[PDB]
Design a binder for this molecule. Sequence first.
Ligand SMILES: COc1cccc(OC)c1-c1cc(C(=O)N[C@@H](CC(C)C)C(=O)O)nn1-c1ccnc2cc(Cl)ccc12
Length: 450
Amino acid sequence: TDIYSKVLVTAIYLALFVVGTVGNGVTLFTLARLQSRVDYYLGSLALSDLLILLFALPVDLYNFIWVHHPWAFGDAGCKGYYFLREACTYATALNVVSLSVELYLAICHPFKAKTLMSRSRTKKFISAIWLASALLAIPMLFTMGLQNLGGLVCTPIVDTATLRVVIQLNTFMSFLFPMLVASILNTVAARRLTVMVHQATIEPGRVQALRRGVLVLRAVVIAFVVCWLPYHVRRLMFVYISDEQWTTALFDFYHYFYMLSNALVYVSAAINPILYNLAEDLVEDWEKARKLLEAARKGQDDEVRILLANGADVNTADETGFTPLHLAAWEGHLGIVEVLLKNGADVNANDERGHTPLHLAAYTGHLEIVEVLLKNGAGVNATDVIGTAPLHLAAMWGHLEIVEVLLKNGADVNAQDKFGKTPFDLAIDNGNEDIAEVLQKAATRELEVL
Ligand SMILES: COc1cccc(OC)c1-c1cc(C(=O)N[C@@H](CC(C)C)C(=O)O)nn1-c1ccnc2cc(Cl)ccc12
């Protein structure tokens, strides 16, 4: 009797329909063309959420919101509707949990993630989820059916006791237990993730990727719970409210509660593509980073420029804490080092061992890179865990030209390490007598000031 309510809902239903159908459609079309196991889950969700908007929404809108009396889809359409709706609630829920499980494993079992996780395994698993959802939905073919009360309505055809149990079961199996598992695992994953963040002078890329996964998956569960709790609460209310005590106050309440509860289920399907965006955006950033470290190590000068331009993180590191700049200098790719520092690479970055790019540049003995790094404000007197300054390494491996370069930029010749050895001492040890003379005079000059 409140027509505005129905009209307002129609607008929102159509809005969620037209966009949500197109959104999930495009997501499936896009995916059709290592971590391609993510895509399978996002494809699984897209499919489940598409089917709800395409088949469930329009039937719901027509024969539950507007036209109450005559059921326009017959006995098959009645049974099918409730089957395909329940199948898709299960699939979506089970997929969302599988997602939080895969993240949890990736975080809390890195060793297992490498071995256990495989494309073939995921394909077989997703097939089981859909099949599990389909089997658990069969009861809806027998529990729901047409009744005449012209007066043809898609109402339960079993006794309330039976109906209360099948739905009570579905609510546990396709929400409560799923969300329980998910929420817990995500919290355990969040607790475990903060351990690995505490290890940080490294800043690993894989950690940063997982860090984001937790944030995305936190949103997915909070989003799923708020969207699906009202729906499940209403269906539980309906089974226990099946007595003919329907006061006009209860009618009014349920009328709006039905509209709102179902609208949020369609919202949950219409936001599904946003998750795809958040996932692909996260995975692409992770992929760009790996490629940047690979290209920097490899020396693919052309690739580096591309990656940086598209938005690859210049200050990424591997498990050990080596940034692309670190590797570029180590492999002696002057052209790359110049590009990285141009795009804003951290000149004073350290690995686990405490080695700045300048350490590795001195070790190898690439004069041109050293001069570049120092121009960009490198730490001349930067020491590692052993206590080795770059001059120590330059002197030890006999790079007299680098030794002169460093001292020019204000290198401390008097610096010592854990073994107490100065660069001059390391030159004498290694037998770089020519370099030692340069350091010998350097120390004597400083004494003259005092
Ligand atoms: C058009 O719907 C009916 C027509 C005649 C009799 C009816 O109830 C016996 C129903 C019916 C069914 C439902 C309902 O919520 N059904 C559940 C069934 C499940 C518990 C299995 C669902 O689809 O989630 N709700 N529901 C409704 C009853 C009364 N007012 C309603 C107002 C609206 Cl806007 C929607 C459904 C209503």
